[PDB]
Amino acid sequence: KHHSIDAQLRQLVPGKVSEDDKLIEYDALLVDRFLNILQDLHGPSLREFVQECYEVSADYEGKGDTTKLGELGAKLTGLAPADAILVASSILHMLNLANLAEEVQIAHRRRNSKLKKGGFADEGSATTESDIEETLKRLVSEVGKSPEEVFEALKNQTVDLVFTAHPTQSARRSLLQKNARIRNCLTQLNAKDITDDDKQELDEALQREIQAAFRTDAQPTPQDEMRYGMSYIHETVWKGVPKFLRRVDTALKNIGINERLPYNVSLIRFSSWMGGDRDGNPRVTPEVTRDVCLLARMMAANLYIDQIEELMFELSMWRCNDELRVRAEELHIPPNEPYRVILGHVRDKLYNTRERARHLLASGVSEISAESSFTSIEEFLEPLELCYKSLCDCGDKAIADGSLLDLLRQVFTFGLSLVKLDIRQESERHTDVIDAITTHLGIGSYREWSEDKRQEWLLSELRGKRPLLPPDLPQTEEIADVIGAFHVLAELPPDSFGPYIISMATAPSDVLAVELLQRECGVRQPLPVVPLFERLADLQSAPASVERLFSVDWYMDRIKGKQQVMVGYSDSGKDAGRLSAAWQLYRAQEEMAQVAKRYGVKLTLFHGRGGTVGRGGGPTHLAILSQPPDTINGSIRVTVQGEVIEFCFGEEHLCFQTLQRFTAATLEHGMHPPVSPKPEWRKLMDEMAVVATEEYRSVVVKEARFVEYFRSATPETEYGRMNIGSRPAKRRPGGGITTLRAIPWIFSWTQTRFHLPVWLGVGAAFKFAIDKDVRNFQVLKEMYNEWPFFRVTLDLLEMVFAKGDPGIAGLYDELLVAEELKPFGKQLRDKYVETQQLLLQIAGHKDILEGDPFLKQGLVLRNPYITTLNVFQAYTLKRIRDPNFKVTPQPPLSEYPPGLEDTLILTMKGIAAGMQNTG
Amino acid sequence: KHHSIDAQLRQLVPGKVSEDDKLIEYDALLVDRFLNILQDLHGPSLREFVQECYEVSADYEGKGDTTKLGELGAKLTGLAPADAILVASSILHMLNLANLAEEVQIAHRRRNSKLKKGGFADEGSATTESDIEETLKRLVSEVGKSPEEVFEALKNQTVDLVFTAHPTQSARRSLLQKNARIRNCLTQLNAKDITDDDKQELDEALQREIQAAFRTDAQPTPQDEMRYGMSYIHETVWKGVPKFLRRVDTALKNIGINERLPYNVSLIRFSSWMGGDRDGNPRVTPEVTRDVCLLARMMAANLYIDQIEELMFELSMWRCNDELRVRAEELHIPPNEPYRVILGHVRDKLYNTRERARHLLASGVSEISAESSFTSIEEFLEPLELCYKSLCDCGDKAIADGSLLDLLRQVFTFGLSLVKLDIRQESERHTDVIDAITTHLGIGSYREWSEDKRQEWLLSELRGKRPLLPPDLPQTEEIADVIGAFHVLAELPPDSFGPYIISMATAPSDVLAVELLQRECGVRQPLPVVPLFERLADLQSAPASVERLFSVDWYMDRIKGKQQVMVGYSDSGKDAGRLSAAWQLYRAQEEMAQVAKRYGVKLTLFHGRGGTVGRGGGPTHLAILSQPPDTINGSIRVTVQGEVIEFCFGEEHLCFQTLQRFTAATLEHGMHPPVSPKPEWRKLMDEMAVVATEEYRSVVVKEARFVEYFRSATPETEYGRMNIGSRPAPGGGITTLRAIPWIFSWTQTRFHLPVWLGVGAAFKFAIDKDVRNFQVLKEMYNEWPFFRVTLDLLEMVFAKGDPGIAGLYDELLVAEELKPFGKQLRDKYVETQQLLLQIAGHKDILEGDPFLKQGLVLRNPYITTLNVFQAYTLKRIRDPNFKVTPQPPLSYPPGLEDTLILTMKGIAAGMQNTG
């Protein structure tokens, strides 16, 4: 009940990483108060049990000795069911608090330019990266671009951030606000010259908010999961984008541009997969898609109604131009406040816009006319731009450039739906539909046809003028879902959507199949069709596939010089290992850009989950700068993984830094590409890729006992049976691991702190390269320090190794895998150790993350809570799986068998929360 | 276009009054940016004209030479009409900006205990006064009371602040928010370790907000006037009351009490006169009163709906006690969120309460049932206290003591109507009604009867059981308004009202007559009747009046041991001068408390306009402490003058300090009374009061041409015919003129005759009567809080005065025959000031409070400019022969009316409270 937890933290990180480093102080302040709440509510004994768990696990990091973990697991398994949930949830809440303190520290850390050493490596951490104006200054003076060149590059830039559902955590809006109050109490408490009484009251508030978070807690609807994905837009991003665009104005002033970024520049846009991605996800029906589109339009309408009402209060002026005065008279509270009369009308039409969507959502029908509401972005902006012009014509541009300019930038960023919905479906599901059509019409089986025959037939249909899809067509459930989805797209406004993405795209016929289905189902404004090239072979042939499409007269007419392609890191890494996937992805990008340049097509890349781009914080800055030259040119899409969305957008300043990161990195790359690889580097990457793929497949594909080990050393099977992914874990009820999807592949191996999908293959490749020529070792480290692609790739592996622990993995082994396969597990752990130390010698580090002590400190302070949940998980699995393993039921301390399922969910949630992004 | 305005301000106050004194820097930041905006929109010529006006006036303060101002006035009268409005409004906006920086400066001044010298004098300024915690610690350790004594005193304490309309200024809610953004930009701009880009953008923001205030322009309804008066409640007081009560909890903990102040303690309450006061105000009809009552209930429902919705977001818990779980089940969005289920129902009934009020306001009728809404504070409280007890029963009292405790404290502070409405009406209007009743019934003329006969008749009616008021009584417009008003009181919920105040109350029959009318018009829960004793003769007989009332069996049964009495400072001062009024008020207070103690009645005093109690900032703290011993005992009502409401409640921290002030001073007085006056002090006050009254009446009553001087030397008649006071100012002496115009007109000219006239005859007489007396007057100033606060008010008003400006009005507007009379009055001014400083032991005005001195003088460049503009504008308004050479442009007869109202608004804004 008495001692603080900070002694254990100082053992982990002796020493401050900066002068204003207070992370351990903050962690102690929050956790000590939590434990006191725990004791007040549940008695001293369990408080001391919980703190002893934390102390044991903290000791383990300093002295990697498994037996003390086994001690702890013995104690944990003996707890009564109620106590087990209570201790697991307590450890979870402490991890949350520690993450909140980590957020506060990042947000308020003073930038210290003495940490910069120059060059691209500075851009890999928030402690050293360039802000937007530093980037603007560099482009002008070091690279030699003119201010007007930079200004027009920005005018043509667009970064599209795509939200995807969080696999394990909901993110209720009311919880995001508890988080904020805890963060606010924390910063205010540690203010400069704070009063005794202020500090006393802030302390009581902090204790109050921690308790409130501790005393609050079936899968959610896809509708609900979408509502929860939009919380971060309501809490930071809505207000955040005007604030960042204003900083871009300030930066432009400070390089000599004497005008603001025009308010119609969509510098940042936001998209969503929630309700649109149905790849292997049959709960995402056509109706779900129609719903999330209407839900988004209600959310937008209410956000705008609030902004407009705040603006009405402010714009009390009476001086206006003639166009506004005539319109204000026509709408006829007081007539001598014309800006309020216009905006009052806009609010009226926004209210109708909202109610119309609400009615369509409930009944499917609305007697509120589309005339009385806003149907297009253009008719929404007409009165707003009239207010802006009027203020400017009267010499009040300074007033206009305040809240009204914020609103206009919000309209051009968010539109009438906040986010544009991406649609995604698997290519073979489209083939199924087309085969159904061809057989029913009696012209054969489209599935049996070769790729060239498919293209020939599709093109004759696309070029012909006679319809194809009979309403009579006999339909499976899956075929009816595909057709029904297209029918929904045809019925909804085109501005609700972005692209239609084809999972597992392999050839041009996959793209033109969707183009034909779109048209024959009546989508009169078709969606851009985006192939997702997942396997290594598909990436290798992607430039050929894109060239064939660009060589077809019909398709060039359709796309109007714009094509989007999606690439997946976790996807391709599951096929051949991360190193080989990384290198083929680089080559595919540079050759696809070459194809696009020859054919006059502007090619935009969409970066899927598990990438270097899309990491939390600074690493994304360098990752974008590291992409092949001339592959961005002001247009890029990046998924915002649910695992990092809290750190990227949960807090005002973190949101700002994220928007600035993507904007600055994208802008600089277009005018300042990284160095082109020299032939020695390409040859080495080529040779290492062969070795890495071979050894990855040697463990993953060609070893007969791999799946049996995987199902024992990981909690996969439980993850699937509990539907923690709200999605089937596999496409076929059998198959190899090739049928398993990426999310479960990465999830299961990071739960055990082993992370095999991220690093396997790298060890074989590094040792092969060094051993075949004495020179190769020096050229590898030269690559690490001069080639951003290689640097960024390896830094990802370093971060994952900091999150890994072979001892914990071996703990899962000893209790869950059969004797026969335990030597296989230690073989894998041998591969782990050899990859890590080879990784360290390249890059020239003696310790993991020696180049980023800030990240090292932040990661290390999470592990006491994580490792505790690790041993709780491993022992919970053994109880779940073995009726004969005996436990000593200890007396209380104030599906599956009792409590075990709840405990396991809690460990899964907590470990995922602590591990965030891996591969 | 070029140089900053801070040079001219340094000239008036060179030195810093504290380490963190940045007031001149702030004034310069705001005004330099304003002047650049002025130039950007209207050209350099006009900007440089406006700045030249400022510097001329700023130079005049340092070198009191009238020639300066005359040449400025020549320039001002030359302006074309559009330029004149534009220059006067510019000067006004700059004064507003200077006031905003003064607000920022007071709000964020770091407390410095080394300034304290111990004793009651520390409580006269915010820089030295005791917080609530230092007050509790002093009561325990310096006075020697126990912590549980102090805790019990707080539980029984009620301070009620009464809002009254602002005579000249709107206070729109959108303006208060522009003010807030300017202040916020100011403080954020001067935060430490601010980044260059943050500073750049904040600067742009501050420029943008100043411009927005500059490009925002019939008198208002009494209804609109009321919702403008409620804006301060929406902006700071609503959130401020729970903040302060939480500080009271912290203070209690730090003296040994380990429980919070119970949430049902009404430590602070709020009242309004807006729509209730109809004294000499024929608009303010019965329906006006009905309207502002329903408007208040709508505003309350809106505020509660917002608080409840934020609370629902927070209270996600699922563990509750049995009582709540049962009622949550009966209300059946998700059922595992019981606290949200209950609060959702509360919100529904609040929505109904609002809509019902809106319907009653528009049509007079509502199909929305009273059952589906909240009609009493008790049924509103029932589900909220259920939530509180449920959270406590589950070991979550810590969560309950957060936002939910804030909400319960708001309910017990504001009720369902935010404020309670005071009704006020003159006593002769009630006599008119009763004389119409007695003549119509053939009983005779109630007006002709002596006071004894009136009481005899009224008491036989109130004791009788037969009704009196015939429904076919012939009614004049005035009589119908009185009866109609009472009829509205009978129709509205009792908790909408506070007391019925009788202006010009003279005798018990005034109080008893209202009790009879109230009953005869059907008010079934009568309002407490409080007399307002205004003339000094009425204050001297006030104790006999309340003793006669307390000796009547019927009235004792009605009041149930509680009586409220109202006293007026500006009212009594207009009768016989401020010094005699102050001393008569003191004796009346101690004599009424003595009567009250003898009859077992709890006497609550209500302090009206123009007092020491009710000044802005620290002086109110000492003023309350200076009240006669045993006249508060935890119960006091104070007027919040509209002149000081911005400085008291406009900003978060100022609101906090205001509530803390009234609470701490009231609490302490009940357990630490001031010294009792020594017999020598009483005898000296008695003799000075005679001399002061006779000197005041010799100028105001007994000099035949005083009204002619008054109507020329001040803008009184223009203030009347423009109805700047929203109220009549029939034709008699000066005795028929109301108090607000009497103070307003003399404050515009910077002369302030009503506040000081008489004081110097009294001081001169006392000193010259006996050589011991000067020493005694100095000891009274250092040892008698009553005398100290009385003279500190005079000192503050002299700081705001300037005889040169008053002489400038004279020279321009007074006939040659009366100019020597004005010179005699300015002689009386200079003599009173000099004698005042001698007794206070000061070489200069406000030498005892350099913080107040600095704040006042930095306003004078803007005020003085408008003074010059005003004086010359009036002579143009009054004289067709006065010639002006029209200057070419720089961008009543034309423009003169609008410039005059602009000067009146600006001067009043800068002068705030005087007498």
PDB file of C-alpha atoms in Angstrom, chain A residues 370-479:
ATOM      1  CA  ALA A 370     -33.213  17.537 -51.936  1.00  0.00           C
ATOM      2  CA  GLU A 371     -33.946  21.115 -53.025  1.00  0.00           C
ATOM      3  CA  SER A 372     -34.429  22.227 -49.410  1.00  0.00           C
ATOM      4  CA  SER A 373     -31.052  20.679 -48.485  1.00  0.00           C
ATOM      5  CA  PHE A 374     -27.467  20.737 -49.761  1.00  0.00           C
ATOM      6  CA  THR A 375     -26.954  18.140 -52.501  1.00  0.00           C
ATOM      7  CA  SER A 376     -23.502  19.162 -53.764  1.00  0.00           C
ATOM      8  CA  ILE A 377     -20.409  20.680 -52.185  1.00  0.00           C
ATOM      9  CA  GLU A 378     -20.741  23.535 -54.693  1.00  0.00           C
ATOM     10  CA  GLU A 379     -24.132  24.805 -53.514  1.00  0.00           C
ATOM     11  CA  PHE A 380     -22.932  24.607 -49.907  1.00  0.00           C
ATOM     12  CA  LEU A 381     -19.958  26.860 -50.711  1.00  0.00           C
ATOM     13  CA  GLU A 382     -21.862  29.422 -52.806  1.00  0.00           C
ATOM     14  CA  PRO A 383     -23.254  31.339 -49.782  1.00  0.00           C
ATOM     15  CA  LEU A 384     -20.017  30.918 -47.812  1.00  0.00           C
ATOM     16  CA  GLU A 385     -17.878  32.318 -50.630  1.00  0.00           C
ATOM     17  CA  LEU A 386     -20.400  35.141 -50.991  1.00  0.00           C
ATOM     18  CA  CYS A 387     -19.809  36.018 -47.334  1.00  0.00           C
ATOM     19  CA  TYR A 388     -16.039  35.864 -47.879  1.00  0.00           C
ATOM     20  CA  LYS A 389     -16.098  38.074 -50.984  1.00  0.00           C
ATOM     21  CA  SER A 390     -18.396  40.589 -49.277  1.00  0.00           C
ATOM     22  CA  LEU A 391     -16.095  40.939 -46.269  1.00  0.00           C
ATOM     23  CA  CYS A 392     -13.106  41.394 -48.589  1.00  0.00           C
ATOM     24  CA  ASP A 393     -14.913  43.978 -50.739  1.00  0.00           C
ATOM     25  CA  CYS A 394     -15.540  46.066 -47.594  1.00  0.00           C
ATOM     26  CA  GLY A 395     -11.916  45.952 -46.449  1.00  0.00           C
ATOM     27  CA  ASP A 396     -12.595  43.267 -43.826  1.00  0.00           C
ATOM     28  CA  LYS A 397     -10.438  40.538 -45.386  1.00  0.00           C
ATOM     29  CA  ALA A 398      -8.672  40.244 -42.024  1.00  0.00           C
ATOM     30  CA  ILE A 399     -11.957  39.190 -40.412  1.00  0.00           C
ATOM     31  CA  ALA A 400     -12.726  36.870 -43.336  1.00  0.00           C
ATOM     32  CA  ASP A 401      -9.318  35.214 -42.918  1.00  0.00           C
ATOM     33  CA  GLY A 402     -10.337  34.126 -39.417  1.00  0.00           C
ATOM     34  CA  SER A 403     -13.176  31.747 -38.619  1.00  0.00           C
ATOM     35  CA  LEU A 404     -14.771  31.966 -42.075  1.00  0.00           C
ATOM     36  CA  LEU A 405     -11.495  30.899 -43.698  1.00  0.00           C
ATOM     37  CA  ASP A 406     -11.290  27.999 -41.229  1.00  0.00           C
ATOM     38  CA  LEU A 407     -14.779  26.888 -42.271  1.00  0.00           C
ATOM     39  CA  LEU A 408     -14.037  27.103 -46.002  1.00  0.00           C
ATOM     40  CA  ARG A 409     -10.922  24.990 -45.478  1.00  0.00           C
ATOM     41  CA  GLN A 410     -13.070  22.512 -43.555  1.00  0.00           C
ATOM     42  CA  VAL A 411     -15.556  22.345 -46.424  1.00  0.00           C
ATOM     43  CA  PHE A 412     -12.792  21.686 -48.951  1.00  0.00           C
ATOM     44  CA  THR A 413     -11.135  19.125 -46.666  1.00  0.00           C
ATOM     45  CA  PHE A 414     -14.160  17.192 -45.393  1.00  0.00           C
ATOM     46  CA  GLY A 415     -16.960  17.866 -47.875  1.00  0.00           C
ATOM     47  CA  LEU A 416     -20.503  16.878 -46.985  1.00  0.00           C
ATOM     48  CA  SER A 417     -19.512  13.370 -45.820  1.00  0.00           C
ATOM     49  CA  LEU A 418     -16.357  13.966 -43.706  1.00  0.00           C
ATOM     50  CA  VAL A 419     -14.697  10.944 -45.344  1.00  0.00           C
ATOM     51  CA  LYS A 420     -14.833   9.263 -48.742  1.00  0.00           C
ATOM     52  CA  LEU A 421     -15.550   5.536 -48.554  1.00  0.00           C
ATOM     53  CA  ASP A 422     -13.260   3.028 -50.238  1.00  0.00           C
ATOM     54  CA  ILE A 423     -14.899  -0.149 -51.547  1.00  0.00           C
ATOM     55  CA  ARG A 424     -12.876  -3.368 -51.566  1.00  0.00           C
ATOM     56  CA  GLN A 425     -13.654  -6.872 -52.820  1.00  0.00           C
ATOM     57  CA  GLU A 426     -11.669  -9.932 -53.885  1.00  0.00           C
ATOM     58  CA  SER A 427     -11.044 -10.451 -57.599  1.00  0.00           C
ATOM     59  CA  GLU A 428     -12.293 -14.049 -57.631  1.00  0.00           C
ATOM     60  CA  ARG A 429     -15.691 -12.826 -56.408  1.00  0.00           C
ATOM     61  CA  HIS A 430     -15.941 -10.717 -59.570  1.00  0.00           C
ATOM     62  CA  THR A 431     -14.861 -13.704 -61.670  1.00  0.00           C
ATOM     63  CA  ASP A 432     -17.684 -15.694 -60.061  1.00  0.00           C
ATOM     64  CA  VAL A 433     -20.231 -13.098 -61.191  1.00  0.00           C
ATOM     65  CA  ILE A 434     -18.912 -12.962 -64.756  1.00  0.00           C
ATOM     66  CA  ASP A 435     -18.784 -16.756 -65.039  1.00  0.00           C
ATOM     67  CA  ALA A 436     -22.417 -16.806 -63.888  1.00  0.00           C
ATOM     68  CA  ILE A 437     -23.259 -14.362 -66.686  1.00  0.00           C
ATOM     69  CA  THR A 438     -21.363 -16.157 -69.460  1.00  0.00           C
ATOM     70  CA  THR A 439     -22.787 -19.585 -68.594  1.00  0.00           C
ATOM     71  CA  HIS A 440     -26.345 -18.255 -68.282  1.00  0.00           C
ATOM     72  CA  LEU A 441     -26.027 -16.584 -71.689  1.00  0.00           C
ATOM     73  CA  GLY A 442     -24.507 -19.793 -73.055  1.00  0.00           C
ATOM     74  CA  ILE A 443     -21.234 -18.416 -74.446  1.00  0.00           C
ATOM     75  CA  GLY A 444     -19.027 -20.509 -72.149  1.00  0.00           C
ATOM     76  CA  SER A 445     -17.237 -20.261 -68.815  1.00  0.00           C
ATOM     77  CA  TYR A 446     -15.319 -17.031 -68.209  1.00  0.00           C
ATOM     78  CA  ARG A 447     -13.404 -18.810 -65.434  1.00  0.00           C
ATOM     79  CA  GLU A 448     -12.000 -21.437 -67.812  1.00  0.00           C
ATOM     80  CA  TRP A 449     -10.760 -18.767 -70.230  1.00  0.00           C
ATOM     81  CA  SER A 450      -7.136 -17.686 -70.358  1.00  0.00           C
ATOM     82  CA  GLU A 451      -6.194 -14.146 -69.363  1.00  0.00           C
ATOM     83  CA  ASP A 452      -5.855 -13.083 -73.005  1.00  0.00           C
ATOM     84  CA  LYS A 453      -9.266 -14.532 -73.916  1.00  0.00           C
ATOM     85  CA  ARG A 454     -10.820 -12.800 -70.893  1.00  0.00           C
ATOM     86  CA  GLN A 455      -9.414  -9.425 -71.969  1.00  0.00           C
ATOM     87  CA  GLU A 456     -10.584  -9.981 -75.555  1.00  0.00           C
ATOM     88  CA  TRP A 457     -14.153 -10.694 -74.425  1.00  0.00           C
ATOM     89  CA  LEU A 458     -14.311  -7.975 -71.756  1.00  0.00           C
ATOM     90  CA  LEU A 459     -13.061  -5.380 -74.242  1.00  0.00           C
ATOM     91  CA  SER A 460     -15.632  -6.373 -76.871  1.00  0.00           C
ATOM     92  CA  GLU A 461     -18.346  -5.909 -74.247  1.00  0.00           C
ATOM     93  CA  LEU A 462     -16.911  -2.634 -72.947  1.00  0.00           C
ATOM     94  CA  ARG A 463     -16.626  -1.304 -76.503  1.00  0.00           C
ATOM     95  CA  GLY A 464     -20.044  -2.607 -77.549  1.00  0.00           C
ATOM     96  CA  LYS A 465     -23.280  -0.744 -76.968  1.00  0.00           C
ATOM     97  CA  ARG A 466     -25.551  -3.646 -75.905  1.00  0.00           C
ATOM     98  CA  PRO A 467     -26.207  -4.391 -72.211  1.00  0.00           C
ATOM     99  CA  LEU A 468     -25.113  -7.659 -70.700  1.00  0.00           C
ATOM    100  CA  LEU A 469     -26.406  -8.301 -67.170  1.00  0.00           C
ATOM    101  CA  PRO A 470     -29.902  -9.845 -67.218  1.00  0.00           C
ATOM    102  CA  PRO A 471     -32.103  -9.064 -64.196  1.00  0.00           C
ATOM    103  CA  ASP A 472     -33.078 -12.761 -64.515  1.00  0.00           C
ATOM    104  CA  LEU A 473     -29.538 -13.922 -63.654  1.00  0.00           C
ATOM    105  CA  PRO A 474     -29.529 -16.870 -61.178  1.00  0.00           C
ATOM    106  CA  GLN A 475     -27.565 -15.688 -58.165  1.00  0.00           C
ATOM    107  CA  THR A 476     -25.694 -17.288 -55.301  1.00  0.00           C
ATOM    108  CA  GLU A 477     -25.589 -15.444 -51.990  1.00  0.00           C
ATOM    109  CA  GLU A 478     -22.098 -14.179 -52.814  1.00  0.00           C
ATOM    110  CA  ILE A 479     -22.947 -13.150 -56.380  1.00  0.00           C
TER     111      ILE A 479
END
